[PDB]
Design an enzyme around this catalytic site. Sequence first.
Site, PDB file in Angstrom:
ATOM      1  CG  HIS A  16      -2.052  -0.964   1.123  1.00  0.00           C
ATOM      2  ND1 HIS A  16      -2.322  -1.868   2.129  1.00  0.00           N
ATOM      3  CD2 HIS A  16      -2.968  -1.194   0.152  1.00  0.00           C
ATOM      4  CE1 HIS A  16      -3.366  -2.603   1.790  1.00  0.00           C
ATOM      5  NE2 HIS A  16      -3.780  -2.211   0.596  1.00  0.00           N
ATOM      6  CG  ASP A 110      -4.892   3.660   1.354  1.00  0.00           C
ATOM      7  OD1 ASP A 110      -5.958   3.470   1.987  1.00  0.00           O
ATOM      8  OD2 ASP A 110      -3.837   3.041   1.640  1.00  0.00           O
TER       9      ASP A 110
END
Length: 453
Positions: A16, A110
């Site tokens: 990520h 995100d």
Amino acid sequence: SSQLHVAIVSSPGMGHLIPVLVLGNRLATHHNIKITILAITTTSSSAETELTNEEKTIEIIPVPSVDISHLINSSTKIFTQLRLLVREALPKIHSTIASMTHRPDALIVDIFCTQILPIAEEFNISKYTYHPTTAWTLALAIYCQVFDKEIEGEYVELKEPLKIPGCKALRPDDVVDPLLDRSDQQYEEYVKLGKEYTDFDGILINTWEDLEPETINALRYNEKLRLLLKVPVFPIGPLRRKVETTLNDEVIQWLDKQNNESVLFVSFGSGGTLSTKQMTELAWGLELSQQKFVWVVRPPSDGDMSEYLPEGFLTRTKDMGLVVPMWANQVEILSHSSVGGFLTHCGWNSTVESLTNGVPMIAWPLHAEQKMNAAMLTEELGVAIRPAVLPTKKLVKREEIQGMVRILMQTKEGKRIKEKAKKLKKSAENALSDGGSSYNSICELVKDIRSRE
């Protein structure tokens, strides 16, 4: 004075952080933007020490999460865990931003951090979400609050597919993991994320207009969709890591002997691993293909490399292939001229590293949105070939694996697929270059930030 402060928030895990590190790098390439990365972590070793620049332009700040072990069990879905962690970490993220001396002008979260939304609102920061996979899977997440209200039983059970207004129909087998089981936590958390998107000032998707022109157009102008959204979409892709110098890349010096586009790259990265039965089949089908390969292996999960492979595998394949333990420099290999194919789980970052290099693919979907990605890469785009039944539903045996390799690498069908990969590579390069759609979409996101300030 003139320069903007953008803060990108990454959920935990290298998988990520790297995309977030890639996104900040692009924002700062062309627009005087100080990037701060709030990196939400969880606990490990003496790595509690939780590229920070000379001019203070790209700083990574660790935000240590609070421990969720008491809100989960051994059968909780990783979607739900990720959501409970960010939920619980919220105060510590409230704290990080509050004590930042330069407070951010704009906050991009995100896709697993959309619950930070109130913090941005309290502190009066422009808010945005970074959707790092297809615009298709984005349009599914948003509309799923309608499919929720008009389908009674399981989704996995349906006879006919799923009409996303404006978009390719989604056959029930190909649905994202949260949607496999309506009784689960993750299902009800997924429907929420979908309704969280619309509360941001915009959504960034790691795609580009040419690759998904209908979906993106549906997002922007569909009657039924634009009820749910009301905010703009910034397709800014395909974003991914540049190629790096490394120290003695055993795989790269191998590939320098091989012929152009003559090696099949096999790797699920960290995404996932195979069971022992599926591993040994893949071992044979590669061995049987009489085809030069590089294979990245992770010891199997049934729920020294030799042990979990067919006996004398490496000894036999010594002339043909290269077996690699744990990990490889994936961007760098896919960038080698001597690579011609890629068997991959279809993680959207791996996919994009393959496409931006004009490497075609064997779509081997495993979890998350990968089935829906492998659907686009074969039916929609024709840059890949998947196994006849999704390898999550039935074992893929060595004969099929064998013909898969031979088609892609050897036949004229393989050469046409790769022709499609090389066209996709080109239209990505245009989209990223000065004047491209992804370039301008970024310059249009900046315009939105500078407007709310």
